[PDB]
Design a protein around this ligand. Structure first.
Ligand SMILES: *C(=N)[C@H](C[C@@H]1CCNC1=O)NC(=O)[C@@H]1[C@@H]2[C@H](CN1C(=O)[C@@H](NC(=O)C(F)(F)F)C(C)(C)C)C2(C)C
Ligand SMILES: *C(=N)[C@H](C[C@@H]1CCNC1=O)NC(=O)[C@@H]1[C@@H]2[C@H](CN1C(=O)[C@@H](NC(=O)C(F)(F)F)C(C)(C)C)C2(C)C
Ligand SMILES: CCN(CC)CC(=O)Nc1c(C)cccc1C
Ligand SMILES: CCN(CC)CC(=O)Nc1c(C)cccc1C
Lengths: 306, 306
C-alpha cells in the first residue's frame, strides 16, 4: 500500500546527458547515436537572449564553436543544424549507452519524469504533468536548460520534453525533441505569461481510485450522475470536461474497485460543491491532478522496466 | 524557481539490483562486489512468516537453494550467512557496476531516495523521510522487499534502508544494510503498530525557507521568539523540539534569505496557532516536513552528482 509521486528510474537517461558549451554559455545536451540535441539558445550571449535572431547567430558559428563534454571525454562536433528551437550537433562518436528510444509529443494531462541536470550532470528526478495551459510545474535553475522529460515502456525511453524557460508564477515551458514548443511560447527573454490553467479532471478521478485502492474511502457517496450533469458542475470550478474517451480510459480502475466511473464522478461533484471539510485524501488537503490513470495502475500494480 | 519532491538519480543503484529466489519466494537483492544482500524472510514460506525461526530455516538451506538472477545471467551462490535481519549471499562474480558506496544508519528526520523494485527490476523512484516513529511513508507492494533507500554524495552511494514490511495505516518498516531494524519492529507476520508520529520541526522550517526563496512570503510575521518559547508551543502541536544543533544546521538558509532562524520560528508559531487561513505554501495546504535543510540547499542551488 501507500501512494507517492513516483518518477521512472533515470539510469537510461543519465547515460545520455552531456555538457554543451558555446563560447561562454553552458547547458545540457541529450546524446543519442551520433547526435547531441540541445536548446538553440546555447548560441546566445545574455544580450542576444533579449531579442535573438537564431538563424543569424548560427550562421556565425562553425562546428569548432561548440564543445561537447561527455564525462572525461570531449566529443568533436562535425556538423550542426537547427530544427525549430533545438540545435542538433553531429559528433564523431555515437553514444554506446544509447537506449532504445522514441521522440513523442504528449497531450495536456499526460505525465512524465524530468531528469534535472546542470553542466551535463544529473541533480535529481521528479514527476511532472503537462498542464492544460501547456506549462509544467517543475524545479529548474540557471543552467538547467536541455534537461529532458521522458516516459519508459519496458526498455524504450520516450523523450517528450526539453527544458527551455521559466514563466511568471515560476512555471516552466519547453519543447518536444523536434524543437516545437508546447504552448504559444517563444525562446526570447521578453514578457510572456501562461494562460489560465485548469484542473485535469480525468487525473483527479484516477487519484480518487488510488485513494479507494488504499482504503481512503470516506468521500464515496451513494449517488450517481450523468456525464453531462457532472461536466456542467466541473466547468464552474475550472475543471476540464470529462469525455467518453476519459471514461473508457478509467475503465480498468473502475473494474478493479467495482466503482462505476459515473459513481466516482458524483463523489467528485460533492467534493467540489462541499469541499473536503478539513479532511485529507492520501495525505493531501487538496485534490491532486498530476497522476494519470496509467500512473495509478503502474504504481498500484508494480509495473517494472528493463 | 519551483520546488518539487526530488529523488536522487537512480542509475548507480539500478546497476546493483538483482532477483533473489529461494524455492518459491522471490524478492530483490542488492549486488555489491561479490555479495548479494537481501531480506532474510526470502527463506520463508507463507506459513513460516507467521512465526519464523530464521536460524532453523537457514540451517536447512544450502547454497543451491538460492537462485540469483542479474539480467539474463544467473549468478552461482557460493556462500551464505545471516547478519541480523539481512541475508548475505556470496556469489561467484563481483558486480562490475558496483559504485563507490557506504552503509549508513540514518537519524529520524533524514531523507533518502527509494528505488522501488519487483523481481530485481526497477519500478520507480521517490523520496522518503525516516519518521520520528521509525516508519517511512512509502509505496510498496508484494515482492518489493529488498528495495533499498539511499543518498548520493558526488560519486558515493550511501545505502541506508532495505525494505521489509508494511504496518497498519499503510506505513513501512525496514532495516539498515547491517540488517538492524529502524524502530522496535520485527520481521514476523504478527500484529504490530507504529507509535504516535510527530512532525519534524527542523524540516518544516527548511521548507519555509524554500518557500521564501521561491517568493512565497505571506506567512512571514514581524515577530521573533526565544527557542524555549517556540518549543513549548510546538510541543502542544506534536512537533519535535528544535535544538541548537537544528538552529546551526539552518544557518546557511538563514544567511541566504536574511531571515533569522528564530524569526522564522515565530512565523511557524503563528501558523501553528492560527492555521493557514485557506492559503497554500509552495502549492500545499499543509505544512511539509519531509525536506531537510540539505534537501532545500541541494534543490535550490543545483547540486549535481557523478
Ligand atoms: C535554461 N538554462 C534557463 C532555465 C531558466 C532559468 C531560470 N529558471 C528556468 O527554468 N532558461 C532561461 O533562462 C530562458 C532563456 C532566456 C531567458 N529565459 C527565461 O527563462 C526567462 N523567462 C522569460 O523570459 C519568460 F518570462 F519569457 F519566460 C527568465 C526571466 C530568465 C526566467 C531564453 C533564451 C528564453
Ligand atoms: C516484501 N516483499 C513485503 C512488502 C509488504 C507487502 C505489502 N506491503 C509491503 O510493504 N513484506 C511482507 O509482506 C512482510 C513479511 C511478512 C509479512 N509482511 C508484512 O508486511 C505484513 N505486515 C505485518 O505483518 C505487520 F503488521 F507486522 F507489519 C503484511 C500484513 C503482509 C502487510 C514478514 C516476514 C514480516
Ligand atoms: C530511434 C527510433 N527508435 C524507435 C524505437 C529506434 C530505436 O530506438 N532502436 C534501438 C533499438 C531497437 C535497440 C537499442 C537501441 C536503439 C536506438
Ligand atoms: C565499501 C566501503 N566503501 C567506502 C567508501 C569503499 C568503496 O566504496 N570503494 C570503491 C571505490 C573507492 C571506487 C569504486 C568502487 C568502490 C566499491
Amino acid at each position: 500500500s501507500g501512494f507517492r509521486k513516483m518518477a521512472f528510474p533515470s539510469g537510461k537517461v543519465e547515460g545520455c546527458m552531456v555538457q554543451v558549451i558555446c563560447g561562454t554559455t553552458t547547458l545540457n545536451g541529450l546524446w543519442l547515436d551520433d547526435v547531441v540535441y540541445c536548446p538553440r539558445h546555447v548560441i546566445c550571449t545574455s544580450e542576444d537572449m533579449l531579442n535573438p535572431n537564431y538563424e543569424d547567430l548560427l550562421i556565425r558559428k562553425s562546428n569548432h564553436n561548440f564543445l561537447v563534454q561527455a564525462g572525461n571525454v570531449q566529443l568533436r562536433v562535425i556538423g550542426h543544424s537547427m530544427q525549430n528551437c533545438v540545435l542538433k550537433l553531429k559528433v564523431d562518436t555515437a553514444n554506446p549507452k544509447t537506449p532504445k528510444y522514441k521522440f513523442v509529443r504528449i497531450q495536456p494531462g499526460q505525465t512524465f519524469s524530468v531528469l534535472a541536470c546542470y553542466n551535463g550532470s544529473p541533480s535529481g528526478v521528479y514527476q511532472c504533468a503537462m498542464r492544460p495551459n501547456f506549462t509544467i510545474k517543475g524545479s529548474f535553475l540557471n543552467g538547467s536548460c536541455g534537461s529532458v522529460g521522458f516516459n519508459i515502456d519496458y526498455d524504450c525511453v520516450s523523450f517528450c520534453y526539453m527544458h527551455h524557460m521559466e514563466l511568471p508564477t515560476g512555471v516552466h515551458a519547453g519543447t518536444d525533441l523536434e524543437g516545437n514548443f508546447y504552448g504559444p511560447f517563444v525562446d526570447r527573454q521578453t514578457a510572456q505569461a501562461a494562460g489560465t490553467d485548469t484542473t485535469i479532471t480525468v487525473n483527479v478521478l484516477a487519484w480518487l481510485y488510488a485513494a479507494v485502492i488504499n482504503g481512503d474511502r470516506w468521500f464515496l457517496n451513494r449517488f450517481t450522475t450523468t456525464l453531462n450533469d457532472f461536466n456542467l458542475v466541473a466547468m464552474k470550478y475550472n475543471y476540464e470536461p470529462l469525455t467518453q474517451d476519459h471514461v473508457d480510459i478509467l475503465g480498468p480502475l473502475s473494474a478493479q474497485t467495482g466503482i462505476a466511473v459515473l459513481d466516482m464522478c458524483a463523489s467528485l461533484k460533492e467534493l467540489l460543491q462541499n469541499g473536503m471539510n478539513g479532511r485529507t485524501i492520501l495525505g493531501s488537503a487538496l485534490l491532486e491532478d498530476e497522476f494519470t490513470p496509467f500512473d495509478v495502475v503502474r504504481q498500484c500494480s508494480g509495473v517494472t522496466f528493463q
